[PDB]
Amino acid sequence: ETTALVCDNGSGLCKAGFAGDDAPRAVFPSIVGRPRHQGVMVGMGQKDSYVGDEAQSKRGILTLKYPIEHGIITNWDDMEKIWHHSFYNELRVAPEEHPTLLTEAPLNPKANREKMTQIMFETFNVPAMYVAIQAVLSLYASGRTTGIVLDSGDGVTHNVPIYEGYALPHAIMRLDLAGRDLTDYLMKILTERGYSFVTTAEREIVRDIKEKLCYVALDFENEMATAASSSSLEKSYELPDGQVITIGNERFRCPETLFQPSFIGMESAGIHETTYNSIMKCDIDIRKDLYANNVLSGGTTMYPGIADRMQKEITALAPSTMKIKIIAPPERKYSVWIGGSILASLSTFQQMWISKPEYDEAGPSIVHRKCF
Amino acid sequence: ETTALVCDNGSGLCKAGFAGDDAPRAVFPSIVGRPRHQGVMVGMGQKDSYVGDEAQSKRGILTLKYPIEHGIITNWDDMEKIWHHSFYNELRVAPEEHPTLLTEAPLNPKANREKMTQIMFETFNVPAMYVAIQAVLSLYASGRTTGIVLDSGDGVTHNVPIYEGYALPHAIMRLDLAGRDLTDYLMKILTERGYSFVTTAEREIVRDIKEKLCYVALDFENEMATAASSSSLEKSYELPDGQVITIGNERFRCPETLFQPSFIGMESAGIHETTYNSIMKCDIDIRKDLYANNVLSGGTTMYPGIADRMQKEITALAPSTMKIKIIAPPERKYSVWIGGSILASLSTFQQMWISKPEYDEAGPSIVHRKCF
Amino acid sequence: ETTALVCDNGSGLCKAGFAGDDAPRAVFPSIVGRPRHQGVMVGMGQKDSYVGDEAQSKRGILTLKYPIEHGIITNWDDMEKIWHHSFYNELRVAPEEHPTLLTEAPLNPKANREKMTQIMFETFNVPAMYVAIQAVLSLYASGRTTGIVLDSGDGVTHNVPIYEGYALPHAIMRLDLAGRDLTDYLMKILTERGYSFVTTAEREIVRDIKEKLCYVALDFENEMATAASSSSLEKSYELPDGQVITIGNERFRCPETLFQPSFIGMESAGIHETTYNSIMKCDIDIRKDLYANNVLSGGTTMYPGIADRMQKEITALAPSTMKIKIIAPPERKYSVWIGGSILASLSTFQQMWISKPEYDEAGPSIVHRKCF
Amino acid sequence: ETTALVCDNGSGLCKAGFAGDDAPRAVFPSIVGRPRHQGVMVGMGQKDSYVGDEAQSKRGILTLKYPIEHGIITNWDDMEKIWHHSFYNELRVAPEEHPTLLTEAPLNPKANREKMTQIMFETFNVPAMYVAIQAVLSLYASGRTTGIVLDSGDGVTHNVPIYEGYALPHAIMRLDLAGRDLTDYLMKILTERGYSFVTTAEREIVRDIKEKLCYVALDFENEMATAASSSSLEKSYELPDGQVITIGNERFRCPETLFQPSFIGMESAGIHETTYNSIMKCDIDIRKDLYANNVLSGGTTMYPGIADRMQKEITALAPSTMKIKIIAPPERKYSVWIGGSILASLSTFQQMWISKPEYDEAGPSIVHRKCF
Amino acid sequence: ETTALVCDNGSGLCKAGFAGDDAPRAVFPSIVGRPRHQGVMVGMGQKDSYVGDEAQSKRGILTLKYPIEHGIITNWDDMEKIWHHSFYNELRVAPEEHPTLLTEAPLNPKANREKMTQIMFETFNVPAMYVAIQAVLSLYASGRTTGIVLDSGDGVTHNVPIYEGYALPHAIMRLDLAGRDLTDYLMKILTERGYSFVTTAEREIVRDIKEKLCYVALDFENEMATAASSSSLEKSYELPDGQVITIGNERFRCPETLFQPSFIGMESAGIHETTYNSIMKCDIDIRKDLYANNVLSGGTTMYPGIADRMQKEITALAPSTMKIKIIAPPERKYSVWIGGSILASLSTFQQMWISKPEYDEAGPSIVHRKCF
Numbered sequence A, B, C, D, E: 001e002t003t004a005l006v007c008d009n010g011s012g013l014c015k016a017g018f019a020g021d022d023a024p025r026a027v028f029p030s031i032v033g034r035p036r037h038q039g040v041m042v043g044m045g046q047k048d049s050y051v052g053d054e055a056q057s058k059r060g061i062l063t064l065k066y067p068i069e070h071g072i073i074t075n076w077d078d079m080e081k082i083w084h085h086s087f088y089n090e091l092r093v094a095p096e097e098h099p100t101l102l103t104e105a106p107l108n109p110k111a112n113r114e115k116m117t118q119i120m121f122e123t124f125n126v127p128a129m130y131v132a133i134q135a136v137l138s139l140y141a142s143g144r145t146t147g148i149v150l151d152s153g154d155g156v157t158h159n160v161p162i163y164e165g166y167a168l169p170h171a172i173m174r175l176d177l178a179g180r181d182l183t184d185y186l187m188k189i190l191t192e193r194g195y196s197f198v199t200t201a202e203r204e205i206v207r208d209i210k211e212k213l214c215y216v217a218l219d220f221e222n223e224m225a226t227a228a229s230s231s232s233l234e235k236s237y238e239l240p241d242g243q244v245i246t247i248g249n250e251r252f253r254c255p256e257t258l259f260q261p262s263f264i265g266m267e268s269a270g271i272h273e274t275t276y277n278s279i280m281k282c283d284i285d286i287r288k289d290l291y292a293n294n295v296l297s298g299g300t301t302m303y304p305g306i307a308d309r310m311q312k313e314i315t316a317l318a319p320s321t322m323k324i325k326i327i328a329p330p331e332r333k334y335s336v337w338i339g340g341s342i343l344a345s346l347s348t349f350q351q352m353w354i355s356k357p358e359y360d361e362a363g364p365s366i367v368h369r370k371c372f
């Protein structure tokens, strides 16, 4: 009878809210900030850890740590702080009266999911829980039942093909190139113009620059020729303390690492070749249905040139007699949460929750038999 | 007073409909498809088994099984599913208000016919039923009363000679080389050009290639020399996912196994030698009447070179003073069903049905004494 | 002074040895096996043709051909191979130093005997050669001078009556129904239980099943009722590759074609009616002497129910005041060879040999004037 | 008079040497490594491509490509580099003074063999060459003349039955599941414990882990329960840079794809069912001789549990009255080369070489008429 | 034919000389001194700018400015004065008859290199020039071909790993903590004992104190406990105008900022953690070769405790099964110049010079293409 909770815990953003809602109520950066300087004035309330937007608003005196790196949780006390801020401070609800739905990247370690279930059932003890694949939730929010999903966020870019509600786990392909790698590459290439960013507070500034000013070029070499010829692609950004920086080709050299990973020295292929290899790893008779239903999700797929570039690259890779369609909804930044809210509100989902007595009888192993 | 049903249950196609009609209403492939992958999307209607054209339209996530192999039913639950789909889903009628006429290849096991009678009288309990030889139905649909019928379908190629309505059971010859063996030989020889088809879904693609592009050469060695000299016999086929394949001699090397079974390592002779030996096993005074009435039936005899090749081979085998005629009607793919509809509509057939009280008094043994 | 050779060349077994011996030294199947597959290993000595027991021991890669069909030699190069294997490989003697006695079925073509004489005198050139009727040799081996002989082997079942050493050629009957026809009928009726045998190697397996497990029922309808009531007549046979088959009425439905030829669609009467009609075709005053001396010979008369069945059928056909005796010795499988060894060792036989100068002066026509 | 060369060009290892030798002199991995980073130091000799063990010793800065994928050569310049390294750098001989024997997988494209002949006669122009089936060479090195060979290497697992030097091409089965697929599955399942291997250099590390630590379980469910109960099957491996990884059930979950291909989403059956279906596709009278001569060859059959598991599975599949023997010699990793050295040293093989004038007269089509 | 010039223009020292020499002839501090007082007496030569050792010898009446700050040239007229003093006053040669090799820190602005090329080709116009990375020259002077170089000078501390002559640009790390920052930290912490230094002339005195008296402690806490317990680590320095100062823990608190940057409020990690992260950012198979070839260069590595401390910290960070070696040659203060002299004397380098016609055709953009 109670309302379930949907909490997408991504590598860079935590999106939590109630099932049945259209948009998540709490979208906050998953960071933990700790003071790196000395406190000299007594009386003022100084906490040992700042979580969420409070870490963002005070980041000039804080070291910021991400509890999740490449979809894998590394710090568990910081992850508990993120979950406590999500439940008690943002959603303002008691977790013991609400089932919680959580998301997880494919090809993740088992101990991550086991410790997630242990924390959900022993520290924030819920009546029930479930762990779902993010690309299945993206396909749920897309409204269709078939297609291949490229979900790229802050740590993980994964392609999962699903045909008529049936997933193909041998064709699920995961690449560890996402928005944090693009932010680091933008930091590396911003030193060519004389702008130096080294701190974790400056990481958020470079990430804001990447969110506001970067775009995907349709043709890379033509865009470098255009940038070298005239200064028409140069854009200006205002730093928080007063300086104005100007960037040229670095607007489109940063997300080009999504298509050319050798910019950061990785042997893997681009996201278009990842999608094509995931499609050709499937059975033949479904491949056409995977060609016309390329579903994009995640914030990293929110550059305003990525759909046409993906369409062009897959059309160059696929045979010319096949129709290529890239599904890029405007709400695809939060589509994992929207699909989780759709899934948790279904009447055919209520018997597939992992309840507390099943956890007590099974221990940290039920989540590998009731979830994928 | 009620209309009888005619259901030709072949090894690769089920053709069911009403007696007195010219064409069968329901022609669907006799396959049962089961999901070989995992289901990840709840709420979507996913059945445990897909039967008929639904298995064909979703074959990329299904393992397809044929319930009938070489004219013998191996899986009986799958055959019950086939009959349930044929009666309730395709013909949309209740089987308890309609007598059902079924077909059977000659020299079949007795347990197949006994279990067919048991399922038709205890699961789909009919007022009456009859089991008929398919070649007699092909002769009924041909409109003549004498001739030797070569019926070749998906599992069984059988020659049955009938003179003036009298069948000769000692000259009935059965060969287990038909369209599925030709399809498997086509998947074997398609690897010479670099095309790999190993799944059961790809077997349907190879079967479609064989149906659309294969033909019987009039002279095999001359066609081999023509295909080796110039690329004029090469044809292109578009795969369901986009690739275009090209085949040369494999258009006529595939049905040449009908005339040279040693292509698949079988000691038996070709269909022309089978027909000639079946004619030579009969009485001499009827042999001329069997020479001018060679009736072709079944889908495997639907290649556009098989009538002239059979005429040439039998004319080479028979003495030159006798007239050889191959009767190949354009409707011979469904001629067993057409002859079943002709036989079931006859007024002289209504007393030869096996009714329910006769089955109750005799048990599963009446069909060996009321049918041949 | 030299020892003569006796070589019974039957349709399914060649039995060769020396005159004066009690049992033939070389009893081997008259088959020629040729490889139907491709040879991939070099150095391993692979012959083009395998003859005799070597063809039986390697029959899984060989097509086996019988040079003699229904008592008539159809392949003469294969018959040369059979005779060469009989002389040089089995008997290990030079044919030019030994006269050879051969057997032949009655009512045979004259060209068969003429070509036999030509091959014996120009390829395996003997000092002398004689051709004898097999039933006269069976009467020689029986030790009596009167009686009617039913000799049934692999191709020919013939009845020959002889009274006091005088044969009656107008009462000699020949029927082309023997052990190979029974093997083909068992091959046909084994498909009712789901066992499929189609190759020439499997024909030898069915022949072994017929030799080991088949028997002649005393009353056919009573045995049908007994087999239909209880499964007490069912016997199990172990196949060469591991399967165990079980047969019921087919143990006695197979040799019942000897008494009911209409099982294989032949208008001729059974062996008992052939024997009775051969007896009543003779003179009346000898008929009683033919009633008490029914001599059985050949392997086809080796079923363990045939003597009592023949006695019952002839006693039903003959008048009740005549004594009917069926002479079935245990050595009747080789009795033609035993009578040939008896005849060739006689001192009154040495001037009825056809020598080489008589063949040189007369050509291939002496065998019609010195032999019957 | 000159010594012939035997060069087994497998999908993952090239084994080249002289005819008449017991072990191949040059066993090197068939990879071509190219630098993926930039070169900053001049004077140091930096080649554009590293072939063989030099690519293995410098793989941390190289992208490694296999010229042969699933037994089919995809890159021909890289295969020319492989052959040049095999002839000039490893064997240290001139190919124009030595005939060369090559091996090839069954059911391969014809263009692969034609181009193999073309490069062997026009770039490394030999006096003569021959292309042989690898399973025939494995049976040659086994010392026997009959048996069914399961040869599983890096790309191709094929079953070929040969009886008395006669192969059965209709029973030859090819499956595209071998050691590279097992290596990719081990990279897939190594992410469950937190170990990430995505580069081509790390694929060699995972292949070394699979070679050193993996084994075939006799019972899969019992071994899974044993691994889940206690940590007695866990083994530790030292990475090349210092970390120690520990694996549990993944020691036997990796080669279980050989018996359960559905672990990588493939519809085909396991190697034991493939062997049983290849035996049952043969003639019956040879099947017992195929039951006791199961010959294992290739490196993929080098797990220390595969012979007992294959024996158990085939004994469960075969009837209990047949003796099942799995022939697994300790030298079966190089047995294709050993059989090639045996075949090339035979005196009966010297006339079956394809010489240079025959190739000049016939063009690149003689290899389909002088080889199988 | 003419001798090339090697000019390492560091942030605090300019080292210029001829190619092929072992030691640089001109090592002078890169400062420009300007008079801050009033000249009251006339006649003798008082220059407006004093460059080099003349600025050091008269620093009591001069304000000293560094033209290079953190590896980036800020004052270009002062840099032209530095280059003019290096060419015409120290080396006493004409720059128009000698090619010049220049060094540059990694991750530097492009405009610095472009203006360097413009000044060297338009003000001190050379026949040819080249810009090289300092760490590649340090690896050249070390004599080895692999290893990771930590080059720490006056403005830039950078780690560059090179494996077999191939650099990895994604693992190159730059930290703006070097000898000038340590000098400023010593200027800050010298006020605790009552010694006040505020002027630019006193900064050279504090730099001399840091060069003569400072050392790296092996254990920091034990050394602070030893300094707090007894005054055994206290050392005395004589000021240029007479006073004697004594320092205690400040001998090892100053270079500890190299390992603990939080002493000057910097969020970055120490040089040992930077080296370990640069090794861990590389591929796995080269990391062991980077563990045993840690190459130190620059004057900031001239403390007589830094090699053992770096060995201890990396051995604590790396796994214990790896060998850690810190290569610290005694000539590593000038090793960038030594490697430049080695590189400029190579015969394989003479075609990679950027000549004057290429500069005239390309303008200020060729140096980003012919150099890294």
Ligand SMILES: Nc1ncnc2c1ncn2[C@@H]1O[C@H](COP(=O)(O)OP(=O)(O)O)[C@@H](O)[C@H]1O
Binding pocket: A008, A009, A010, A011, A012, A013, A014, A152, A153, A154, A155, A179, A180, A207, A210, A211, A212, A298, A299, A300, A301, A302, A303, A333, A334
């Ligand atoms: N407008 C935008 N353009 C480009 N990148 C964006 C934009 N908005 C967000 N991102 C990137 O998306 C990443 C997070 O996306 P999302 O998948 O929604 O969160 P998470 O990865 O935490 O699940 C961030 O690293 C951010 O850099």
Ligand SMILES: Nc1ncnc2c1ncn2[C@@H]1O[C@H](COP(=O)(O)OP(=O)(O)O)[C@@H](O)[C@H]1O
Binding pocket: B009, B010, B011, B012, B013, B014, B152, B153, B154, B155, B179, B180, B207, B210, B211, B212, B298, B299, B300, B302, B303, B333, B334
């Ligand atoms: N036009 C065609 N050309 C060649 N083969 C065909 C054609 N149409 C059908 N077939 C083959 O005929 C087989 C089935 O024939 P049919 O006798 O009608 O069905 P069934 O064998 O199930 O009774 C199929 O395997 C199919 O491959």
Ligand SMILES: Nc1ncnc2c1ncn2[C@@H]1O[C@H](COP(=O)(O)OP(=O)(O)O)[C@@H](O)[C@H]1O
Binding pocket: C008, C009, C010, C011, C012, C013, C014, C152, C153, C154, C155, C179, C180, C207, C210, C211, C212, C298, C299, C300, C301, C302, C303, C333, C334
């Ligand atoms: N024990 C037996 N029972 C039944 N039939 C047998 C037996 N032994 C042999 N036969 C049959 O006898 C035939 C051959 O008999 P025989 O006359 O001795 O040889 P041939 O006919 O070659 O002269 C064979 O076809 C075989 O099937």
Ligand SMILES: Nc1ncnc2c1ncn2[C@@H]1O[C@H](COP(=O)(O)OP(=O)(O)O)[C@@H](O)[C@H]1O
Binding pocket: D008, D009, D010, D011, D012, D013, D014, D152, D153, D154, D155, D179, D180, D207, D210, D211, D212, D298, D299, D300, D302, D303, D333, D334
């Ligand atoms: N001891 C071993 N255990 C398991 N697998 C092995 C072993 N040795 C080799 N292999 C596998 O065998 C494959 C190659 O086997 P082989 O047939 O000798 O070479 P190729 O396939 O190139 O002809 C390699 O992929 C390797 O992973």
Ligand SMILES: Nc1ncnc2c1ncn2[C@@H]1O[C@H](COP(=O)(O)OP(=O)(O)O)[C@@H](O)[C@H]1O
Binding pocket: E008, E009, E010, E011, E012, E013, E014, E152, E153, E154, E155, E179, E180, E207, E210, E211, E212, E298, E299, E300, E302, E303, E333, E334
């Ligand atoms: N013996 C020494 N002990 C400590 N530091 C030194 C020593 N010698 C030089 N340095 C420091 O090294 C720095 C310059 O080193 P170097 O790299 O040779 O010059 P540059 O940085 O100008 O290229 C100076 O700032 C100086 O403080």
Ligand SMILES: [Mg+2]
Binding pocket: A008, A009, A010, A011, A134, A152, A153, A154, A298, A336
């Ligand atoms: Mg996400």
Ligand SMILES: [Mg+2]
Binding pocket: B008, B010, B011, B134, B152, B153, B154, B298, B336
């Ligand atoms: Mg049919």
Ligand SMILES: [Mg+2]
Binding pocket: C009, C010, C011, C134, C152, C153, C154, C298, C336
């Ligand atoms: Mg006989």
Ligand SMILES: [Mg+2]
Binding pocket: D010, D011, D134, D152, D153, D154, D298, D336
């Ligand atoms: Mg191999």
Ligand SMILES: [Mg+2]
Binding pocket: E008, E010, E011, E134, E152, E153, E154, E298, E336
């Ligand atoms: Mg320096």
